[PDB]
Amino acid sequence: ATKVVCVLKGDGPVQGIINFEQKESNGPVKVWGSIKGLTEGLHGFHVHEFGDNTAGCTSAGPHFNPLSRKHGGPKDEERHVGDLGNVTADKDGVADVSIEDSVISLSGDHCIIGRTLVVHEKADDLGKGGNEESTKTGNAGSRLACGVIGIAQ
Amino acid sequence: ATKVVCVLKGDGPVQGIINFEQKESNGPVKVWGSIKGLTEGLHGFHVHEFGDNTAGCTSAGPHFNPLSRKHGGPKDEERHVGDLGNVTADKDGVADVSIEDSVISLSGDHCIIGRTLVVHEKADDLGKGGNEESTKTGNAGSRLACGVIGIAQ
Numbered sequence: 001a002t003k004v005v006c007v008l009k010g011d012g013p014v015q016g017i018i019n020f021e022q023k024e025s026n027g028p029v030k031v032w033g034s035i036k037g038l039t040e041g042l043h044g045f046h047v048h049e050f051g052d053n054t055a056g057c058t059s060a061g062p063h064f065n066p067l068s069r070k071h072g073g074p075k076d077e078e079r080h081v082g083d084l085g086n087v088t089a090d091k092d093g094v095a096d097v098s099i100e101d102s103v104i105s106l107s108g109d110h111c112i113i114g115r116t117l118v119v120h121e122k123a124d125d126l127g128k129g130g131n132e133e134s135t136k137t138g139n140a141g142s143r144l145a146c147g148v149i150g151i152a153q
Numbered sequence: 154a155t156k157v158v159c160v161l162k163g164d165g166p167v168q169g170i171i172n173f174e175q176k177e178s179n180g181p182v183k184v185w186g187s188i189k190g191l192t193e194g195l196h197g198f199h200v201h202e203f204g205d206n207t208a209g210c211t212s213a214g215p216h217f218n219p220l221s222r223k224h225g226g227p228k229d230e231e232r233h234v235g236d237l238g239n240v241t242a243d244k245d246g247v248a249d250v251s252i253e254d255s256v257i258s259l260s261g262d263h264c265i266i267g268r269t270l271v272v273h274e275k276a277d278d279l280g281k282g283g284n285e286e287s288t289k290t291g292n293a294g295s296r297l298a299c300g301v302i303g304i305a306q
């Protein structure tokens with residue numbers, strides 16, 4: 001079982017640790033951990049293309065999209081590979097994260113190792129906003145914190 | 154072909170950006186960039202096993218060592234895959250880094266993508282210091298800055 005980990009840091013107080021674990025190729029990835037310092041409610045949660053922090057979270061580039069599709073929710077067929085939807089921050093600003101996804105992988109051309117996990121300013125509208133931005137970024141706004149996705153023990 | 158990047162950060166003044174590029178699947182990797190905030194002289198420069206920054210640079214684990222060998226300089230047959238030797242900081246505290254290595258890879262068994270680049274406090278003794286520390290860490294001492302090695306544009 002491939003085990004990977006991401007430490008989210010940014011300019012502000014948003015920080016967290018997210019774990020990923022995949023039992024087989026093309027099988028589901030379990031994604032779990034916590035993020036603190038968030039405003040209460042929905043925050044867009046995406047794998048972006050580049051493991052490049054040279055200019056903070058900006059250098060991570062767009063949502064990881066090797067199939068060249070439009071933005072969606074994780075349950076949509078039409079989605080970016082990086083589209084993990086929303087995490088929910090409780091009133092204390094802590095998001096417990098627990099997601100299962102079969103589109104991201106820890107091997108092959110959909111592999112997210114060496115790419116960047118980003119937690120966003122606002123809710124992802126899951127491609128249902130009816131503007132161009134909806135079908136690119138989900139209108140989730142600015143990058144609060146990010147980390148390069150690395151191999152764990 | 155494959156281009157990757159690492160942003161080195163820590164709890165002190167050491168900061169840098171290191172690029173890796175590999176033209177052919179199994180050929181040499183070009184390593185270049187710059188690190189600032191260092192003491193003048195030699196600093197150990199290693200790929201460590203885990204792309205895990207949960208507890209700062211300490212969580213990166215030992216030198217990346219898939220062939221279970223003892224520590225050496227990059228030109229030793231007996232070396233860790235992660236053994237890239239030393240970088241040299243000038244009087245200004247800046248190491249201009251430029252290395253070519255054919256034991257690290259950006260593909261396959263010796264691939265360093267999603268692992269951690271660390272720059273150390275002291276010189277790597279290349280395993281010739283005459284103690285246990287020498288043949289594991291090269292006595293390069295404390296981890297000043299590290300980053301997960303990520304996919305670049």
Ligand SMILES: *[Se]c1ccccc1C(=O)Nc1ccccn1
Binds near residue numbers: 107
């Ligand atoms: Se999983 C990962 C992360 C970064 C770069 C390459 C890979 C990878 O596993 N790719 C790959 C190529 C061919 C067959 C299987 N995996």
Ligand SMILES: *[Se]c1ccccc1C(=O)Nc1ccccn1
Binds near residue numbers: 260261262264266267
């Ligand atoms: Se390059 C890398 C980094 C992390 C995990 C896997 C890989 C990778 O590329 N593996 C691989 C599999 C098959 C053929 C070539 N590379």
Ligand SMILES: [Cl-]
Binds near residue numbers: 096097098
């Ligand atoms: Cl949970």
Ligand SMILES: [Cl-]
Binds near residue numbers: 228
């Ligand atoms: Cl050497």
Ligand SMILES: [Zn+2]
Binds near residue numbers: 046048063118120137
């Ligand atoms: Zn995003």
Ligand SMILES: [Zn+2]
Binds near residue numbers: 063082083
């Ligand atoms: Zn998307």
Ligand SMILES: [Zn+2]
Binds near residue numbers: 293
């Ligand atoms: Zn080291």
Ligand SMILES: [Zn+2]
Binds near residue numbers: 224236289291
């Ligand atoms: Zn070593």
